[PDB]
Subunit: 229 residues, 3 copies
């Protein structure tokens, strides 16, 4: 009764009803097959349980008197990668041969989330300065590489599929770069301030990315051609 | 020497000889292909070494003088998902196209296991009651969705393949519901009692479902038409 | 300040530049397709970050005044498994149907790693002797099983491919057996000596298998036939 929250509580509330909204709208989709709603169904479910937990402050251990954001990165080890996989399905409306490109995105993602779970596990104020630089640096090499698929020479192949991927990649970068920015200040990122505003900022951001990604794909593809299985 | 056990010891002993039993019987199976014993081979192997540890009292950490069932859920995070995957193989003889339902199943399971590992990691006597109802509730939505595959309208397709999944899910539910029941009483489930009967019940149940599942599929499919690679 | 390293530092240095060498050499490979350098690209990247950490003494925890090799096995939980995956690619130049043998290796692997992470998590001096023998034991049964694919009856099928996997498994066994050997002495393996030597030995060994495995495949296949996609 000394420390109660209602931000993470309502978080899971909207997530639960989200997946359910697909159960009713399943009678007929808005042009885009259920495949999109599928991956977008698991993201809210899992994260939901993790949110309500943050409310009761469950899933955190007091190391050296300092509270670690264990529940924060854990959800960022399963949700984020899944958020990366949803992109693969967005462009790939069908599969015929096992691609290796997907394996490149999955592996590189694991390396990023690693720098995120260790950042909060800083043992000293000096070590936190080293790992921090390693996190952003990783995103650099990954940015130049993820920006390769959009070859300027392949633009002759199909401009249609190129435009779609060019629109979803834009908002994608804004998010992935968003977190690294806010990290510049606050806890576990140079900044000794209250943990109230911190948990409030890292809460509203993922949300702005969750729902924002849903409506994004809707206008991204914009197709009226349906195909049953 | 003041807390020795022989229950978990015999556990791994029976699992080890189990996989080997297939190595000799591999000369020829009971009509059912080797893919069945394959998945059923990894289950006892991994879980085997896990239980053996429970005997030596390993894989457990003493936090604040409180013992945690760390190794308990661990085996339930790798074995259970595999116990689910086996169902997909028993219902699918040969694959020709990558399904998506297999993903929604493996995902929803990860959610269930999550509530299981946290259930024991209760930080308060009040937070435990909350995380508890969350686990069962999660099984509710999954129960209505898992019971969907057997559509009454798709019965016009094949009554043979249907009756196969019917008998399978039947016993599958009794088990999945079994644990949630015993949880009502005992540690990590509202019940301050000895840890002897606790580990004695939670150990006998998995074993009752381990061997019971093997003989189940044998009579479940019952086929005399084998196919080589 | 006092406890500083430099071996793990140069470790990541050689790994980062490695993957970069492929970026420039990508213009044309030494006969072997990029698939080989693909898996050989992620292995050094991830491990790199894990190494530099060992230098700044990050990733470990102080349990009862003791230092656990947490980050040590961590890399051996994702890297090692991939080390096997690379082997499946060197043998299969093209896939047409999903195999089950691939799952047999990946599964049995998780089992070995389990004994590797718990070996250092020994809570007693007696339990360490029990967990140790358990690890090498599992390595025995898998040894005969992995030595099976090279059947003497299938020699009449293809001597070319048979010779490739024969030379590949040779060096592969030398390393897999290497670690089990050194474990007979030192911390977490019967031996109360300075951690300076232990950390220095388990450092050069992996590096000896990292770069050694790269050039190994180059001379293993040695093909001039290239195929594009």
């Amino acid at each position: 009764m000394n420390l109660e929250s209602l931000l993470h509580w309502i978080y899971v509330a909207g997530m639960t009803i989200g997946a359910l909204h697909f159960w009713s709208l399943s009678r007929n989709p808005r042009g885009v097959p259920q495949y999109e709603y599928l991956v977008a169904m698991f993201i809210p479910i899992w994260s939901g349980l993790a949110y309500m937990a943050m409310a009761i402050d469950q899933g955190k251990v007091e190391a050296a008197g300092q509270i670690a954001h264990y529940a924060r990165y854990i959800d960022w080890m399963v949700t984020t990668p899944l958020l990366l996989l949803s992109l693969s399905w967005t462009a790939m409306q069908f599969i015929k041969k096992d691609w290796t490109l997907i394996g490149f995105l999955m592996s590189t993602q694991i390396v990023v989330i690693t720098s995120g779970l260790i950042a909060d596990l800083s043992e000293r104020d000096w070590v936190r300065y080293l790992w921090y630089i390693c996190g952003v640096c990783a995103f650099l090499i990954i940015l130049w590489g993820i920006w390769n698929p959009l070859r300027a020479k392949t633009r002759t192949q199909s401009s249609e599929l190129a435009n779609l991927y060019d629109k979803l990649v834009t908002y994608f970068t804004v998010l992935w770069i968003g977190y690294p920015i806010v990290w510049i200040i606050g806890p576990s990122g140079f900044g000794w301030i209250n943990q109230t505003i911190d948990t409030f900022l890292f809460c509203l951001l993922p949300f702005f990315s969750k729902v924002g990604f849903s409506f994004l794909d809707l206008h991204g593809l914009r197709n009226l051609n349906d195909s049953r299985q």
